Motif scaffolding. Sequence first.
Motif, PDB file in Angstrom:
ATOM      1  N   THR B  33       0.833  -1.186   0.000  1.00  0.00           N
ATOM      2  CA  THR B  33       0.000   0.000   0.000  1.00  0.00           C
ATOM      3  C   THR B  33       0.871   1.241   0.000  1.00  0.00           C
ATOM      4  OG1 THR B  33      -0.110   0.004   2.396  1.00  0.00           O
ATOM      5  CG2 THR B  33      -1.849  -1.148   1.214  1.00  0.00           C
ATOM      6  N   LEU B  34       0.327   2.324  -0.527  1.00  0.00           N
ATOM      7  CA  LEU B  34       1.040   3.589  -0.571  1.00  0.00           C
ATOM      8  C   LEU B  34       0.236   4.587   0.238  1.00  0.00           C
ATOM      9  CD1 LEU B  34       2.849   5.035  -3.588  1.00  0.00           C
ATOM     10  CD2 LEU B  34       1.287   6.515  -2.438  1.00  0.00           C
ATOM     11  N   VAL B  35       0.708   4.894   1.441  1.00  0.00           N
ATOM     12  CA  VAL B  35       0.039   5.874   2.285  1.00  0.00           C
ATOM     13  C   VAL B  35       0.473   7.255   1.820  1.00  0.00           C
ATOM     14  CG1 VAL B  35      -0.282   6.750   4.554  1.00  0.00           C
ATOM     15  CG2 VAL B  35      -0.121   4.345   4.231  1.00  0.00           C
ATOM     16  N   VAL B  36      -0.464   8.031   1.299  1.00  0.00           N
ATOM     17  CA  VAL B  36      -0.154   9.343   0.756  1.00  0.00           C
ATOM     18  C   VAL B  36      -0.866  10.385   1.610  1.00  0.00           C
ATOM     19  CG1 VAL B  36      -2.026   9.545  -0.991  1.00  0.00           C
ATOM     20  CG2 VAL B  36       0.229  10.492  -1.421  1.00  0.00           C
ATOM     21  N   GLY B  37      -0.218  11.517   1.817  1.00  0.00           N
ATOM     22  CA  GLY B  37      -0.791  12.547   2.663  1.00  0.00           C
ATOM     23  C   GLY B  37       0.277  13.366   3.354  1.00  0.00           C
ATOM     24  N   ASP B  38      -0.168  14.507   3.879  1.00  0.00           N
ATOM     25  CA  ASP B  38       0.691  15.532   4.465  1.00  0.00           C
ATOM     26  C   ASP B  38       1.322  15.007   5.743  1.00  0.00           C
ATOM     27  OD1 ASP B  38       1.955  17.912   4.982  1.00  0.00           O
ATOM     28  OD2 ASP B  38       0.130  19.056   5.375  1.00  0.00           O
ATOM     29  N   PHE B  39       2.635  14.804   5.724  1.00  0.00           N
ATOM     30  CA  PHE B  39       3.328  14.198   6.847  1.00  0.00           C
ATOM     31  C   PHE B  39       4.316  15.121   7.529  1.00  0.00           C
ATOM     32  CE2 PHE B  39       2.620   9.887   4.702  1.00  0.00           C
ATOM     33  CZ  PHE B  39       1.367   9.829   5.257  1.00  0.00           C
ATOM     34  N   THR B  53       9.607   7.759  -2.301  1.00  0.00           N
ATOM     35  CA  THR B  53       8.772   7.051  -1.341  1.00  0.00           C
ATOM     36  C   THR B  53       9.660   6.205  -0.446  1.00  0.00           C
ATOM     37  OG1 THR B  53       8.482   5.096  -2.717  1.00  0.00           O
ATOM     38  CG2 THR B  53       6.972   6.922  -3.059  1.00  0.00           C
ATOM     39  N   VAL B  54       9.407   6.257   0.856  1.00  0.00           N
ATOM     40  CA  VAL B  54      10.205   5.522   1.826  1.00  0.00           C
ATOM     41  C   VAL B  54       9.381   4.349   2.350  1.00  0.00           C
ATOM     42  CG1 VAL B  54       9.566   7.055   3.749  1.00  0.00           C
ATOM     43  CG2 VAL B  54      11.710   5.755   3.859  1.00  0.00           C
TER      44      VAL B  54
ATOM     45  N   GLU C  31       4.496   1.888   1.440  1.00  0.00           N
ATOM     46  CA  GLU C  31       5.266   3.039   1.009  1.00  0.00           C
ATOM     47  C   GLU C  31       4.666   4.313   1.580  1.00  0.00           C
ATOM     48  OE1 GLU C  31       5.468   3.017  -3.223  1.00  0.00           O
ATOM     49  OE2 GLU C  31       6.953   1.407  -3.321  1.00  0.00           O
ATOM     50  N   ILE C  32       5.533   5.287   1.836  1.00  0.00           N
ATOM     51  CA  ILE C  32       5.170   6.545   2.477  1.00  0.00           C
ATOM     52  C   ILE C  32       5.549   7.682   1.545  1.00  0.00           C
ATOM     53  CG2 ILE C  32       5.644   8.073   4.405  1.00  0.00           C
ATOM     54  CD1 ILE C  32       3.897   5.630   4.979  1.00  0.00           C
ATOM     55  N   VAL C  35       3.206  14.195   0.081  1.00  0.00           N
ATOM     56  CA  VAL C  35       2.623  15.251  -0.726  1.00  0.00           C
ATOM     57  C   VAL C  35       1.882  16.169   0.223  1.00  0.00           C
ATOM     58  CG1 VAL C  35       2.330  13.679  -2.632  1.00  0.00           C
ATOM     59  CG2 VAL C  35       0.437  14.167  -1.142  1.00  0.00           C
TER      60      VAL C  35
END
Lengths: 155, 155, 68
Positions: B33-39, B53-54, C31-32, C35
Motif C-alpha cells: 500500500t502507498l500511504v499518501v498525505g501531508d506528513f 517514497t520511503v 510506502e510513504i 505530498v
Amino acid sequence: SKEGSVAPKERINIKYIPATGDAQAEVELPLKTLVVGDFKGHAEQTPLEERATVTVDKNNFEAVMRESELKITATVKNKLTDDENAELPVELNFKSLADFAPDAVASQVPELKKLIELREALVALKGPLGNIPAFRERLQSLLNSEESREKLLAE
Amino acid sequence: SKEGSVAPKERINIKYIPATGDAQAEVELPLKTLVVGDFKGHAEQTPLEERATVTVDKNNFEAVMRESELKITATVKNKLTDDENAELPVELNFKSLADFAPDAVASQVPELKKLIELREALVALKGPLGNIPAFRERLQSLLNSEESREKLLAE
Amino acid sequence: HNSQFQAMESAWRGLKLFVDRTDFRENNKVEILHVTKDELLEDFEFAPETAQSGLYKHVYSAGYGQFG
C-alpha cells in the motif's frame, strides 16, 4: 463512460472489464431489407430517384437520427393556465433516442424550462428547510414586515 | 536493554530470554500500500516526480521519523505569567515516538526547562526535609537574619 | 493541541497505528509519500494526461508497471 487505461505496449495491458460481453456472426450477401415509410414530419420536395437510402445498424443509429433533423413543429393545447381554449405551439429538435423522453422534450419548450427550474428551486429548498428550525421564526417576521418583503419579490 | 551473553562457539550458548516471543509469515509480491498525505509541516519546493517514497516497517519506523526532521515551529499562547494577551513561539525537533510526549516537548522549550528543573529541585528537597527536624529551627533564623538571606538569594 | 501540531500528529501517529497492527512478517510492505493535498491537484494540472502525472509515476510505474 470510459475506463482509465494505460498506453498499449509489449507489456500486457489488463483492463478490468466492468462490462460483461456478447458475440457476433457473419454470412454471404447479408439478408438486406429496405424499410420504407414516412420517417420525418413533412414531404420532401426532391423526387424519389435522387434521394438516398441510409444504412443503419446498432452502432450508427444515434448518428442517423441526428443527421435526419426530425423537427416536429405543431400547435398543441395549452394546459399551463386556467384557459381551456388556449393553444401553444412548440419547437422540437431531436438528436438522440433520449430526446423522445420528457426530460429533453420539456427542455426544448421554454414555457417548461421555467417549470423544471421552478422544481429545481423547490428541491433545493427542502434540504436545508427542516434542518434549521429558525426559518419559521423569520416567516413570522416576513408576516410582520410586509412592505420590505414585496419589494424583494420583484427582484 | 541488552542481555549479557558470551561469545558464540561450538559449545552451546544458553541465554535466558527474559522475553517471550512472537512469530512471522510470508507471501508473493506483498500487498503493498502507498500511504499518501501531508506528513510534515510545510510544502516542499521539489516537484512531485523527483521526490521519493520511503518503506516503513515496525523495525525502521524510528529511523524514518528521525530522518524526516519534523520541525514544528509555531506561535502558541503564553500561560506562564499573568498575561492573557501574551504569545510564545516554540522550537521542536522530533526524532522518536517519545518526542511527542510532554517529557521531550517541554525539554525542547527553554521556558519549560527551568520549570522541570524547578520541580527536580523541589523533589530533591522533600526527602531530607521531614527527616531532620533542625531545618525549621533555622527557618526562624532566616526569619531573624533577613539581611544575609537576601544577599544569598541572588547568588 | 495546535492546528499545526495536532494535524501533523494525527497524520503521523495514525501511521504508527497502521504500522503496529499490520504483520510485516506476513508479506506486507507500505510506502510513504510526502505530498500535500493542494500540491496533488496541481500535479494533475501539471501533466496534460493522467498517464504522465507525477503521482502516476509512484503508483503505477515505480510499482506495478515495473519488471520485478
